[PDB]
Amino acid sequence: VRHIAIPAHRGLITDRNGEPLAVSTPVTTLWANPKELMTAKERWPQLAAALGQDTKLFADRIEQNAEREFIYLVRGLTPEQGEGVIALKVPGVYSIEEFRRFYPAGEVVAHAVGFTDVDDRGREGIELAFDEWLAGVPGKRQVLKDRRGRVIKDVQVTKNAKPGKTLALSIDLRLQYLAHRELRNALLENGAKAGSLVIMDVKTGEILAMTNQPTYNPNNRRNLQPAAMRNRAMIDVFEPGSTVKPFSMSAALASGRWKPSDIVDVYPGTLQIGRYTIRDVSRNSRQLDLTGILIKSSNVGISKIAFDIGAESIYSVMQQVGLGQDTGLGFPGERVGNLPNHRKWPKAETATLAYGYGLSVTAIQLAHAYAALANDGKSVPLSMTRVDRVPDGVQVISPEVASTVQGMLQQVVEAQGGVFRAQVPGYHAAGKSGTARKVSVGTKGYRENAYRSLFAGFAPATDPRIAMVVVIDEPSKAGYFGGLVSAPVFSKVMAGALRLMNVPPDNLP
Numbered sequence: 001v002r003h004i005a006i007p008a009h010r011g012l013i014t015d016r017n018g019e020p021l022a023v024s025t026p027v028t029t030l031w032a033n034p035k036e037l038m039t040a041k042e043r044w045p046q047l048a049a050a051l052g053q054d055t056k057l058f059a060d061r062i063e064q065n066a067e068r069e070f071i072y073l074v075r076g077l078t079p080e081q082g083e084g085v086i087a088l089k090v091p092g093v094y095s096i097e098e099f100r101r102f103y104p105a106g107e108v109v110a111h112a113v114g115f116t117d118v119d120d121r122g123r124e125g126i127e128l129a130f131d132e133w134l135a136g137v138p139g140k141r142q143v144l145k146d147r148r149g150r151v152i153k154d155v156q157v158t159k160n161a162k163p164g165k166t167l168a169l170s171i172d173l174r175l176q177y178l179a180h181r182e183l184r185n186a187l188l189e190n191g192a193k194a195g196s197l198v199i200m201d202v203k204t205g206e207i208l209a210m211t212n213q214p215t216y217n218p219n220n221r222r223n224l225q226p227a228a229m230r231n232r233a234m235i236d237v238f239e240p241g242s243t244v245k246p247f248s249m250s251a252a253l254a255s256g257r258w259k260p261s262d263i264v265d266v267y268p269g270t271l272q273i274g275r276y277t278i279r280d281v282s283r284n285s286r287q288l289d290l291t292g293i294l295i296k297s298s299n300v301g302i303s304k305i306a307f308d309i310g311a312e313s314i315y316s317v318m319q320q321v322g323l324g325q326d327t328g329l330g331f332p333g334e335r336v337g338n339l340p341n342h343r344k345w346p347k348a349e350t351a352t353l354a355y356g357y358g359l360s361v362t363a364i365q366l367a368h369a370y371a372a373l374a375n376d377g378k379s380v381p382l383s384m385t386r387v388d389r390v391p392d393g394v395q396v397i398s399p400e401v402a403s404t405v406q407g408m409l410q411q412v413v414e415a416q417g418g419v420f421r422a423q424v425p426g427y428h429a430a431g432k433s434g435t436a437r438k439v440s441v442g443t444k445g446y447r448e449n450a451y452r453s454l455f456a457g458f459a460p461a462t463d464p465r466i467a468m469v470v471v472i473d474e475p476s477k478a479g480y481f482g483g484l485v486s487a488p489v490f491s492k493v494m495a496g497a498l499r500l501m502n503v504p505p506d507n508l509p
């Protein structure tokens with residue numbers, strides 16, 4: 001006598017509130033004993049029709065396997081259409097109860113959640129990451145044959161399978177939906193080719209939403225683009241441009257060489273460093289103060305400061321806030337990125353670092369860096385499961401240096417000539433826009449037709465609760481600046497995010 005393994009019930013995956021994101025539904029599998037089927041050949045065409053198979057090819061198969069002990073007829077029928085075949089009473093055919101995954105939210109959380117293969121085994125996303133947790137231990141039942149090789153059902157020897165454990169994600173489904181809508185809208189409005197949006201609780205390190213475009217339906221995956229399956233927020237890296245200037249500025253303030261009211265001469269909006277040149281886009285002034293360097297996004301201005309304080313001070317801050325650093329999440333295919341070191345930093349590499357080039361980070365890392373800045377310089381570890389206690393973070397930027405930079409970032413949103421489209425009705429919002437040329441397809445240089453539109457920020461400025469990053473690849477029909485393309489998305493999603501968490505408005509009306 002032999003065994004057939006009976007599969008375990010895979011553990012439920014939910015959002016932070018209990019909304020189901022991946023549930024295992026019962027499905028029927030039918031197998032047969034050819035030694036018995038060959039005695040009821042008259043019933044084969046009826047059976048084959050009930051299985052939706054060709055009557056001849058079905059017969060061909062049962063014939064070739066006549067001497068065999070055990071064969072599958074079909075895997076993964078519904079419980080209704082499955083027991084339809086059982087009701088035909090055909091001798092030699094039996095049922096097994098199996099499980100198949102279903103994803104209620106579909107493409108909205110597909111990238112995060114991932115999916116299981118045909119055998120209900122985790123293969124992408126959280127399904128793969130927490131596969132041990134979610135799987136459980138399968139059982140088994142013994143099949144009992146008699147004197148003539150017929151199997152009997154009246155008696156059953158069974159070891160019950162142990163069901164998998166429930167997993168509550170950090171993601172808020174209500175907030176994911178909102179984030180997914182707006183990123184899709186922005187991507188279609190601007191004719192963009194890809195995008196990512198990350199929402200994080202700055203206090204708990206929880207990822208409240210993480211969505212990407214293009215996406216896919218994990219319930220129907222026939223013919224699928226590899227590009228559509230990428231969780232770009234964790235799997236793809238980019239040079240973050242001027243969105244890392246507040247960290248350069250943090251290093252400046254902490255060095256004791258600079259104060260907010262210092263002025264810097266940025267004339268004529270260019271700075272030649274040997275065989276290469278630094279350029280300011282808005283060459284509208286000769287002199288800017290520190291806040292003005294962020295507002296007008298002066299690459300020349302921040303470069304001069306970097307020469308004064310040195311790259312070592314800048315590199316440390318960026319490293320402490322998590323840029324180019326392991327997140328500790330353990331997501332499948334997740335990228336650490338690259339924050340380089342040189343022993344002795346030349347001026348060119350010192351400058352480009354100061355305004356966010358030469359380093360590569362993920363959206364989740366950028367959002368994590370802004371969360372520390374938002375949480376009074378107190379970096380807290382990332383989590384994609386529901387957090388039951390506010391964890392021990394690390395004070396990476398000084399509480400005072402943080403408040404200053406918080407104030408400065410609030411100005412780039414609210415001050416004149418600032419990123420006014422990032423403003424949130426009823427809330428004081430802080431953040432920084434960015435526009436960056438994409439790196440050349442396998443060459444030293446950069447593209448000049450392809451841009452990445454960035455906006456990173458947090459709100460409310462009076463007591464930051466959540467931080468957000470928006471990234472849009474290759475906008476192509478309605479401008480391309482970050483404060484034009486990414487900022488409106490930030491504004492839209494942040495507005496909804498805050499009210500959904502019942503955050504009190506601090507900027508009336």
Ligand SMILES: CCN1CCN(C(=O)N[C@@H](C(=O)N[C@H](C(=O)O)[C@@H]2N=C(C(=O)O)[C@@H](C)CS2)c2ccc(O)cc2)C(=O)C1=O
Pocket residue numbers: 241242243277278279281282296297299352357433434435436437446451481482483484
């Ligand atoms: C090391 C070599 N290398 C890499 C490429 N490279 C870059 O791509 N630079 C970018 C660049 O500075 N963008 C700025 C930024 O980051 O914030 C500003 N963003 C804005 C925004 O609203 O968000 C604006 C206000 C306008 S501008 C830029 C320049 C020209 C453009 O036609 C568009 C964007 C460099 O500078 C550079 O030297």
